[PDB]
Design a protein around this ligand. Structure first.
Ligand SMILES: O=C(COP(=O)(O)O)[C@@H](O)[C@H](O)[C@H](O)COP(=O)(O)O
Ligand SMILES: O=C(COP(=O)(O)O)[C@@H](O)[C@H](O)[C@H](O)COP(=O)(O)O
Ligand SMILES: [Zn+2]
Ligand SMILES: [Zn+2]
Lengths: 318, 317
């Protein structure tokens, strides 16, 4: 059933596992993601960006998530606004039925980040909805990136009461996160300190790994992504063990679908039925995701708890 | 709103136009079709084959169609089972909430076709759901059984179906005739079947395989050099003689495929599915606009108040 981010990640903090949060834009993506979490009996977070909602005129995406919730009632499923920037985007998402939202005001100074985030927490928690916020900015270390200062994270959470905190540790969006695989620099040592000082679930953004087979397929069949590099899965597993409970992954699913289509285009150029290539694209998403979900550690946990509904969740904040 | 095939094609027969029936399989395909019919204020039929329902684990396509019905409350939209073979398949589309079903028993001798079809008509009509059947078999003229108009009249009298698919030389796929220079159809009989039966007629296998769409696929790595469709002028003529529903699937498949192949070649560094499926969706829309304009349904979406499935039950009691 629909599940809050607070309960879902609370459970991952407790057992020291992490839950992948996968952005969705259409039917095949959601199916690719659900087949993997179902096969592994794992909880899941489906997140929707403003770009996704625009792409699907909103109602179509809302309906697709309904289908998922209905087809697999036994899977704790969190529907999350991936990256809202105002209170307005939050009311909109909550109206569509989401159980969680992210409010990102990290590019503002501390007190303004606190203020904007506090407004959202009041509105969301009044309806039982979870809130994720961010302190610090994304970008690679190798000047202007602002990594999370643990002592300030402690203060931020105390002042806002967010349910989860996105941390800045050297990751960034996209398929080109580091200049090479031989020199990957992350600031994961502080995760444990942030987790202990805040006492709450942490979130990592820009965390696709850019798996070898997915990249090789794209470049083998006419794609041009020779220098792609993502976050090593070992690093993510280390951060998970230190308190990271939610890992945002999008690029990996993007590449897996693109590589799959590119291969069908080359091996069978006479085929023109979209199911002929979107099918293998959906499945390549499932196959790429299975070893990832196991490493995150959420496999087997879908049946660990009884899902609290949004209505009952209101009591946590009163 | 959700509309029955009986009413939608009834309005088309009366005003001498045809309504496109487009097969859907996922979100982008439904969006591209909807944008075209919404832009042209045209009624529309979205049809789902058994393959589509398997491709989409059924529930996802049901929900997407609901999204279309809710987003555009003013467009009469018929949700039809594209090609059921058994009463079992019809029952499953009805349980998903479809407003129309096709039961094709055309490969069976006349009597058995009639028997199988009647059983589906009894079940469907008790819910107000429309039924399309077929007399004659698909396939080109150059074993194919073209529709015998006098038999078509008896078949319709005996079954009570709301629409009849006719066999006049069309066939499914992108290689309908050996060359564009030798295209032979049996359109002469459409008018006769129309008058003899008194009901809306349906054309299957009627994608036109438009040149631009064909050129794009072959320009960017595709391999469909000999593809050929039904000329649009031939469909326009059949519509004026009684054809009210025209099934089109290959054209949208090709329009989406050519668009993705072009982005792949022009921006080989792009890997976000929205970057190519977006253009794939718009290609479908642009390819469909001139097609819907020629079918004649533009501007008719507001001609009638839509009778719901519940009220429709009265038509058959
Ligand atoms: O961190 C994320 C994924 O990063 P990634 O490149 O997969 O390592 C997500 O939360 C992003 O915010 C998301 O992928 C952005 O999607 P759009 O805004 O382009 O739709
Ligand atoms: O007549 C039709 C379209 O023909 P076409 O090749 O587009 O001229 C449809 O009714 C077909 O039945 C439909 O395209 C079949 O779809 P699937 O069974 O492959 O899903
Ligand atoms: Zn994000
Ligand atoms: Zn058909």
């Amino acid at each position: 059933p629909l599940c809050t981010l607070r309960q879902m990640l609370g459970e991952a903090r407790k057992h020291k596992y992490g839950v992948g949060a996968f952005n969705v834009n259409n039917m095949e993506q959601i199916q690719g993601i659900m087949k993997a979490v179902v096969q592994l009996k794992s909880p899941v977070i489906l997140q929707c960006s403003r770009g996704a909602l625009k792409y699907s005129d909103m109602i179509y995406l809302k309906k697709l998530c309904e289908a998922a919730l209905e087809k697999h009632p036994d899977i704790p499923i969190c529907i999350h606004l991936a990256h809202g920037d105002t209170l307005e985007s939050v009311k909109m998402a909550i109206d569509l039925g989401f159980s969680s939202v992210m409010i990102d005001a990290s590019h503002h100074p501390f007190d303004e980040n606190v203020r904007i985030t506090k407004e959202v927490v009041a509105y969301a928690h009044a309806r039982g909805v979870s809130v994720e916020a961010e302190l610090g900015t994304l970008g690679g270390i190798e000047n202007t990136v602002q990594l999370t200062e643990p002592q300030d994270a402690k203060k931020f959470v105390e002042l806002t009461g967010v349910d989860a905190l996105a941390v800045a540790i050297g990751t960034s969006h996209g398929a080109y996160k580091f200049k090479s695989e031989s020199d990957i620099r992350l600031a994961i040592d502080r995760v444990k300190t942030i987790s202990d000082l805040t006492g709450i679930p942490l979130v990592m953004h820009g965390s696709s790994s850019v798996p070898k087979d997915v990249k090789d397929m794209i470049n083998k069949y006419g794609g041009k992504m020779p220098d792609a590099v993502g976050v090593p899965i070992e690093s993510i597993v280390h951060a998970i063990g230190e308190g990271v409970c939610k890992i945002n992954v999008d690029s990996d699913s993007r590449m897996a679908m693109t590589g799959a289509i590119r291969k069908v285009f080359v091996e069978h150029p006479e085929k023109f039925d979209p199911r002929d290539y979107l099918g293998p694209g959906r499945d390549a998403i499932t196959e790429m995701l299975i070893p990832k979900i196991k490493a995150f550690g959420s496999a087997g946990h879908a049946g660990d708890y009884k899902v609290v509904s949004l209505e009952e969740a209101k009591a946590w904040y009163k």
